[PDB]
């Protein structure tokens, strides 16, 4: 976006080195369990 290898921007809108990782977790967790039965979703 304005960067992208550890965070993408800031208070602008982007930010995130973290919200992809918690997105991977939260989705695949509640699909199986609380973390995927084994965290084998890929983990992020």
From Swiss-Prot:
Disulphide bonds in the chain: 9-14
Localization per Swiss-Prot or TrEMBL: Secreted
GO cellular component: extracellular region
Domain of life from the UniProt record: Bacteria
Keywords for the protein's UniProt record, in alphabetical order: Antibiotic, Antimicrobial, Bacteriocin, Disulfide bond, Secreted
UniProt GO BP: defense response to bacterium; killing of cells of another organism
Major localization listed first in the record, in broad terms: secreted
Function: Bactericidal activity; inhibits closely related Lactobacilli, Listeria monocytogenes and ivanovvi, Enterococcus faecalis, Carnobacterium sp and Brocothrix thermosphacta.
Assigned protein family: Belongs to the bacteriocin class IIA/YGNGV family.
Official protein name in the record: Bacteriocin sakacin-P
Gene: sakP
Residues of the full protein shown: 19 to 61 of 61
